[PDB]
Design a protein around this motif. Structure first.
Motif, PDB file in Angstrom:
ATOM      1  N   UNK A 194       0.827  -1.201   0.000  1.00 36.74           N
ATOM      2  CA  UNK A 194       0.000   0.000   0.000  1.00 36.74           C
ATOM      3  C   UNK A 194       0.865   1.257   0.000  1.00 36.74           C
ATOM      4  N   UNK A 195       2.114   1.108  -0.425  1.00 35.53           N
ATOM      5  CA  UNK A 195       3.044   2.230  -0.476  1.00 35.53           C
ATOM      6  C   UNK A 195       2.400   3.441  -1.142  1.00 35.53           C
ATOM      7  N   UNK A 196       1.704   3.202  -2.248  1.00 34.91           N
ATOM      8  CA  UNK A 196       1.036   4.274  -2.978  1.00 34.91           C
ATOM      9  C   UNK A 196      -0.031   4.940  -2.117  1.00 34.91           C
ATOM     10  N   UNK A 197      -0.554   4.196  -1.147  1.00 34.80           N
ATOM     11  CA  UNK A 197      -1.582   4.715  -0.255  1.00 34.80           C
ATOM     12  C   UNK A 197      -0.965   5.520   0.884  1.00 34.80           C
ATOM     13  N   UNK A 198       0.036   4.939   1.537  1.00 32.54           N
ATOM     14  CA  UNK A 198       0.711   5.603   2.647  1.00 32.54           C
ATOM     15  C   UNK A 198       1.565   6.765   2.149  1.00 32.54           C
ATOM     16  N   UNK A 199       1.977   6.691   0.887  1.00 31.76           N
ATOM     17  CA  UNK A 199       2.797   7.739   0.290  1.00 31.76           C
ATOM     18  C   UNK A 199       1.928   8.870  -0.249  1.00 31.76           C
ATOM     19  N   UNK A 200       0.693   8.539  -0.614  1.00 35.31           N
ATOM     20  CA  UNK A 200      -0.236   9.528  -1.145  1.00 35.31           C
ATOM     21  C   UNK A 200      -1.053  10.166  -0.026  1.00 35.31           C
ATOM     22  N   UNK A 201      -1.386   9.370   0.984  1.00 35.27           N
ATOM     23  CA  UNK A 201      -2.167   9.855   2.116  1.00 35.27           C
ATOM     24  C   UNK A 201      -1.266  10.143   3.314  1.00 35.27           C
ATOM     25  N   UNK A 202       0.021   9.854   3.161  1.00 33.81           N
ATOM     26  CA  UNK A 202       0.987  10.079   4.230  1.00 33.81           C
ATOM     27  C   UNK A 202       0.664   9.215   5.446  1.00 33.81           C
ATOM     28  N   UNK A 203       0.478   7.919   5.212  1.00 32.46           N
ATOM     29  CA  UNK A 203       0.164   6.987   6.287  1.00 32.46           C
ATOM     30  C   UNK A 203       1.429   6.341   6.843  1.00 32.46           C
ATOM     31  N   UNK A 204       1.932   6.889   7.943  1.00 24.66           N
ATOM     32  CA  UNK A 204       3.140   6.369   8.573  1.00 24.66           C
ATOM     33  C   UNK A 204       2.794   5.351   9.655  1.00 24.66           C
ATOM     34  N   UNK A 205       1.742   4.575   9.413  1.00 25.64           N
ATOM     35  CA  UNK A 205       1.306   3.562  10.367  1.00 25.64           C
ATOM     36  C   UNK A 205       0.354   2.568   9.708  1.00 25.64           C
ATOM     37  N   UNK A 206       0.424   1.313  10.141  1.00 24.35           N
ATOM     38  CA  UNK A 206      -0.430   0.267   9.591  1.00 24.35           C
ATOM     39  C   UNK A 206      -1.379  -0.275  10.655  1.00 24.35           C
ATOM     40  N   UNK A 207      -2.431   0.484  10.946  1.00 24.44           N
ATOM     41  CA  UNK A 207      -3.410   0.080  11.949  1.00 24.44           C
ATOM     42  C   UNK A 207      -4.805   0.569  11.572  1.00 24.44           C
ATOM     43  N   UNK A 208      -4.969   0.957  10.311  1.00 24.42           N
ATOM     44  CA  UNK A 208      -6.252   1.447   9.822  1.00 24.42           C
ATOM     45  C   UNK A 208      -7.302   0.342   9.834  1.00 24.42           C
ATOM     46  N   UNK A 209      -8.566   0.735   9.955  1.00 26.83           N
ATOM     47  CA  UNK A 209      -9.666  -0.223   9.978  1.00 26.83           C
ATOM     48  C   UNK A 209     -10.944   0.402   9.429  1.00 26.83           C
ATOM     49  N   UNK A 210     -11.648  -0.345   8.586  1.00 26.63           N
ATOM     50  CA  UNK A 210     -12.890   0.135   7.994  1.00 26.63           C
ATOM     51  C   UNK A 210     -13.730  -1.022   7.464  1.00 26.63           C
ATOM     52  N   UNK A 211     -14.883  -1.244   8.086  1.00 22.61           N
ATOM     53  CA  UNK A 211     -15.780  -2.318   7.676  1.00 22.61           C
ATOM     54  C   UNK A 211     -17.032  -1.758   7.009  1.00 22.61           C
ATOM     55  N   UNK A 212     -17.213  -2.083   5.735  1.00 26.14           N
ATOM     56  CA  UNK A 212     -18.370  -1.612   4.983  1.00 26.14           C
ATOM     57  C   UNK A 212     -19.506  -2.629   5.037  1.00 26.14           C
TER      58      UNK A 212
END
Length: 106
Positions: A64-82
């Protein structure tokens, strides 16, 4: 008809919500404090009865480099249940009542 996990698949995170089905996201790192400290709660936090009918995709910061690099996510603990194309709950930074609160709605 038996769970559904996807190893680092940002393209799936959307397909899971565009299908109107129960799918939660859980980011992890090589050895982060969240995934390392959550490894103990991965039992009870993932022992819920809705955890069986609720998909869960494990994405890594290496994919998800493109995600953390685009959204500046310096952590992997996100959560979202649809749930049926609707955002139930979300939480970042180690477990929390807002991250598991999504399990009550699958």
């Amino acid at each position: 008809q038996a769970a559904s996990v996807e190893p680092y698949s940002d393209a799936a995170f959307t397909q899971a919500q565009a299908s109107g089905a129960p799918v939660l996201v859980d980011v992890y790192a090589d050895w982060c404090p969240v995934c390392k400290r959550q490894e103990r709660e991965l039992t009870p936090l993932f022992a819920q009865p809705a955890q069986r009918d609720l998909r869960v995709f494990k994405v890594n910061f290496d994919t998800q480099k493109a995600a953390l690099q685009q959204f500046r996510v310096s952590q992997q603990s996100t959560l979202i249940l649809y749930r049926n194309g609707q955002e139930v709950r979300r939480s970042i930074g180690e477990t929390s009542p807002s991250a598991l609160s999504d399990f009550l709605t699958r």
